[PDB]
Design a protein around this ligand. Sequence first.
Ligand SMILES: [Ca+2]
Ligand SMILES: [Ca+2]
Lengths: 249, 576, 151, 151, 50
Amino acid sequence: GSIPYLDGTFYLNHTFKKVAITFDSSVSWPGNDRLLTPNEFEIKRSVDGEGYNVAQCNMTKDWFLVQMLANYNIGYQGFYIPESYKDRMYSFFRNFQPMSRQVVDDTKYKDYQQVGILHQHNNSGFVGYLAPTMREGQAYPANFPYPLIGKTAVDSITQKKFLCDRTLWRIPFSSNFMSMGALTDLGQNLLYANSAHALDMTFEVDPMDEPTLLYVLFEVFDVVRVHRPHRGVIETVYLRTPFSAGNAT
Amino acid sequence: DIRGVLDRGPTFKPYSGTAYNALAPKGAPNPCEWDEAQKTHVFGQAPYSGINITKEGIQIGVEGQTPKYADKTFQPEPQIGESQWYETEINHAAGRVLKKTTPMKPCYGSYAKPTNENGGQGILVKQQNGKLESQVEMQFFSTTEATAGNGDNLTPKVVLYSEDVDIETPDTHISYMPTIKEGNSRELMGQQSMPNRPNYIAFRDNFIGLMYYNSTGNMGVLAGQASQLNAVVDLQDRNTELSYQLLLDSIGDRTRYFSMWNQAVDSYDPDVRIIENHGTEDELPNYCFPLGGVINTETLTKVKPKTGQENGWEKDATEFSDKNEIRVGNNFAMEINLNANLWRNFLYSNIALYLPDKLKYSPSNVKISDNPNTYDYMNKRVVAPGLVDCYINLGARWSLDYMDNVNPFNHHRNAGLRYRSMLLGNGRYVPFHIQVPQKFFAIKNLLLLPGSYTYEWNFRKDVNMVLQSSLGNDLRVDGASIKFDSICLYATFFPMAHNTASTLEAMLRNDTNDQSFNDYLSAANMLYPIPANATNVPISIPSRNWAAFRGWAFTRLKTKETPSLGSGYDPYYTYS
Amino acid sequence: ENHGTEDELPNYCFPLGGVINTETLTKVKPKTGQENGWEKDATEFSDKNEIRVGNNFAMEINLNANLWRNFLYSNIALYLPDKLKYSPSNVKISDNPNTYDYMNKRVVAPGLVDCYINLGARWSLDYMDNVNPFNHHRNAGLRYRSMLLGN
Amino acid sequence: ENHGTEDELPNYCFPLGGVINTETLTKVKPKTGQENGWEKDATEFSDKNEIRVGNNFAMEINLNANLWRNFLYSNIALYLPDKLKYSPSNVKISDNPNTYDYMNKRVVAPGLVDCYINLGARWSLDYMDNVNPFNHHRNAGLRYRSMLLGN
Amino acid sequence: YMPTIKEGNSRELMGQQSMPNRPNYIAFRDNFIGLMYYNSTGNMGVLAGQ
Ligand SMILES: [Ca+2]
Ligand SMILES: [Ca+2]
C-alpha cells in the first residue's frame, strides 16, 4: 500500500497526547514560564476541569495557538481564516476537522440493557441474518438503537474528538514561535552556538495493538557548493549542520 | 468564554425518513390479535422451523438424548428463518405475536425497549414476593381438516408465543385513520404511517443575538479604573451585526468554514429556489424477477421415439423420473420506472411540503393543535402531491409563484445550518462550551496601553433569539432552554522586549498619534410599516443640513420576522 | 470511464400487505389427563385464523446496474453513426435522412453499448471519435440558451 | 454524514400487463315491460368478457433507503479491521492473512454498519480512525494511474 | 452460501448463492517513487568528470 514515509500520506497525528523537552536534563524549554501549563505542550485533553479546550473540540488552546503561529504568523492579533495562497494542500488549517456525538449513559439510565450484535433485530423481516445473503425472518417492532430525540429520549453523555491527517506536527526553535527568517534568532545566540548541550524529549501517546514507529525530523541546514575550474572537471563541497558529517584535517 | 447546559426540546429531528424498519412496506401490520362480535381473531407469521412440538414448547436441539426446548423469554428470534430459496415443507413452525392489550401500529417505525440482556422485549411484572417475572403465553394451532375429524392424533402444527411489548413510535405519524372509534378493532388494520418533517436546530451564525448591542438600556462598559468614564457610546439605530457580516464578506473569502467562531454562511440550494425540469431518462424498462428465476412451472414426463411406427411415441422412465418441472414461454416479471420515481420523490420532499399554509387542508379523524406556530400544526397538515408533480412547467427554467415570497433560507438543505447543527451532536441534551468574539467597531481593533480597566457586558437567555430552527416553531412553547454556568475572559500578549515596548508607549501617548476608527456600514437605519395589501408608502424628513451625504440603500422585510431591539425581552416575537 | 457498479446487496420488493400466502388454522389446546392428547378449543377464538408458515413473498431487482445501463443507453448508444442502426418494421418512415422523423424512428440494438464494454478502461469508442460532441442534449450552454427564451 | 433519506412517498411496481386478476362476466340488458328484472344478451356482445374489480395488484419497495444502504455497506463495512469478521462455513480458505484470497473470503455482518448508525451525527467510526484511508478504490489518483496503463 | 459440503451434483446444491469479488487496482506509484535508488550507500549514483 501507500508508504507514508515516502509519499507523505500520514493519518495518525490525532493519537499524540503530550510532548516535553529539556536541555541539560534540568532546564525546560518552553522558557521562562510561557505556556498556560507549566512545563510541556499538551496536545489533547480527555477530562477538563478548568476549560482549556477550543474550537469545540478537545485540543488545548495552546497547541492551537502554536500551530497557527508556526504556520501563518497568525494568533497574536486574533484568529481568522488565512488566505488561499498561504494555505497549501499539506498545510494545517486545510486539514482540521472537529467532531462530536452523544451516546446513552449506562450508569445513569436506569433501564440500560447491553445488547450484542447477535441479538439486534431492527429491520427484522426483510434482511439477511449476519450475512449479505437472502432475506429471512418475520416482521416485528425493533429493539435498536435507543432513541436520542423525541419526547421519550434517554439520558446521554457526549464525546468529542478531532481528525487531522496529511500534515506533520511542527515546533519552531524561535523565541516567540514566529517565522521571522530562515536563520532563527535562537540558533545564533552564543549560548546555543559556543558550548554543548544534551537533549531529552518525552512523548506520551495513546496505545495501539501493533508495533509502531515514531518519526522525528530535526530541521537543519543542508547546503551544497559547486565549482568548475576547467573543462570536464567538477568539484563539490557539502555542509550539514548541526548534525555534521565530514572529514577534518 | 462560555459554558453551560442546552436543551433543544422535544421537536428536534435532524434526519429525514425514519430509523426503524425503514425497509418495510408502509402498510404492513404487526402480528396482532383482536376482538370481534365476543371472540378473538389472530393474524401473524411463523418463520422458524423446528423438530417436534409437545406441550412444553418446541424442541430446538438435543442435549445428550434429552430434548431441549425454547427459552420463552427471547426464543425464536424475529430475524431467524430458513435459508434455501426454494420452498420446502415444514411441519413444526413457531413464531411470536402481540397480545390484545397492546395498541396496533404499522410495522414501519415501531420501537420497544429491550428488557433483558439476551435481547427480548416483554413487560416484566411484579410477583407476589418481591420479584420481576416475565409473562408469555403459548398458543397452539392445528390444521382445519385435521380437527375436522376425530382427535385420534390431532397433533399441533404451529406454536405462537404471545407477549405484550411497550410499543411506541418516536418519529412517525399516522397519515390515514379509517375510523375515529378508539380501542382495538378490525378497522384499524388499515392505517398507514409516514415520517415527520426534518427539523434542525443550532446556534446562529457568528453567535448573533448572544450579546446585547444597540440597546441603551443594557449598554456595555469599558472604562478607566478610576475615571469611570464610559468609552462606548451606542445609539439606538447603529445596526452592528449586519455591518460585521458585510465586513467579513469584504475582507476575505466566505464559502469556507471556521469552527472556532461558529462561522458558517447561510445559503440555499441553487436548484430548489429555481426548478430546472428536464424530465427523466427512461427509454429502457426496468423489470424485476422472481427470486427463484421462474415460479410458474408445470409437470411433464419423458417420452421416447418408438421403433417401426413412424410416430410411436412411447413412455420411458427407466432413468428419468416420471415427473419433471418445466416452464413454457417467458418467465413472470413485474415492471417499475426508476428515474421518474426518484425525481418525483425529490420534488415532493423539497418543494411540495414548504408551500404556503393557505393551500393545505386539515386531516380527518386526527387531533391537531391550534397555535399555527407549533411544530405539531406544521407537521400534521397534508398537501396534495398534485400541486407539484413530475410534470410541472416542463422544459422551463422557472420558479413557482407561491414559493417566491416564502423565505428560502428556512429549509433543511441550508448547508450552513446543518453544519452548525451537527457541530453540537445529534442528541437532545447538550453540555456546550463556546467562545464568542467582540464586534463593536470602536474597540474591535483598539490597541490598549498599560493600566487598569473595567470591562462589563450583558448576554441574552431568550431562546427564540440565540437559536435558529429550520422551520419556525416558536421555541419558547416547545420547551427549549439554555442555562449558563460560568464565564471567563481570555487575553493574549505579544512578548515584546521591555525597552522597545516603553518606547512604543511613549510615542503612542503623544496626542498627534491618536487612533481613528470607522464603522463599515456607516449609515443610519430607519424602518417604516406597510399594512396588508398596500401599494404606496410616502415618507418625509424635515428641513435640516445635508453636508457630506453619501446616498440611499433600501430593502423590504416581513414584520413577522423582526425583533423589537431596544428592550430587555420582546414577548410578542414568536418565530425563529 | 467504467468502474462497474456497486451491487453487493440484493434489493427486494415485498407484498403490499406484508404477506399474501396465508392459510387457515384452528386453535387447539392440550387435553388434560392423557398425555399428548389435544382437543379443539373455540370458546374464545374463532375457528378460522390466518397464519403464514415460512418466509414471505418477495421479488428481486438490481438497482445500480439498471441505473448505469439506462444512462449508457440514453446518452451514448442513440448518438451512434447512422450506418449501424437498422430500419424498423411495419412502421412508415420518411426518406429524407436529414429530417427529425428519420433520426427519431430508427432503432439501434442495446447490445452495441451495454454495461460491459471496455471494463475498467478509461476509453472512448472509436465509432464516436468522428462525431461532433457538441451536438448533444447535455451541452449546458445550448440548454441554457434554449431555456432563456422559454419552453 | 448521515442525514437519513427522503422517502415520503411509496414507490410501487405494477404488473407487466396492467392487471392480472381479471374475472369473467356476461352481458346483460334490462327487461322491458316489468320496471325491473333483466335478461341475457348475445346478439352483439360475446358472452365472455374479462374485467377486474377494485384496484390493481402492485408490490412496494423503498427506493432511496436501498441505495443508501448499498453505498454504506460497499464503501465502509468491508474495510473494517480484520478482528471483526468471522470465517465462512463449508468453504476452503487460505491461511496466510495477507493473500488476496483470504482478504476476499472473510465475511462481515451488515448489522455493524446499517442505515441507522450515528443518525444525524457528523462522525467517523472509531474502528476506522486507525485504519489507513488511502488504501481504497475511490482513491482517485490511484484509479487514474491504474487506468492509464490499460485494463 | 454453501448448503452442503458434499461433492458432485445433488438436490441440496441447488440452493447456493453467488457474490462478486472485491475490486482491486494495481499500478505504478506516484512520481514513480521507488524506481530509483536514493540514500543507500550500497548503490549510490555517480555523476563525475570522465
Ligand atoms: Ca401445477
Ligand atoms: Ca403437473
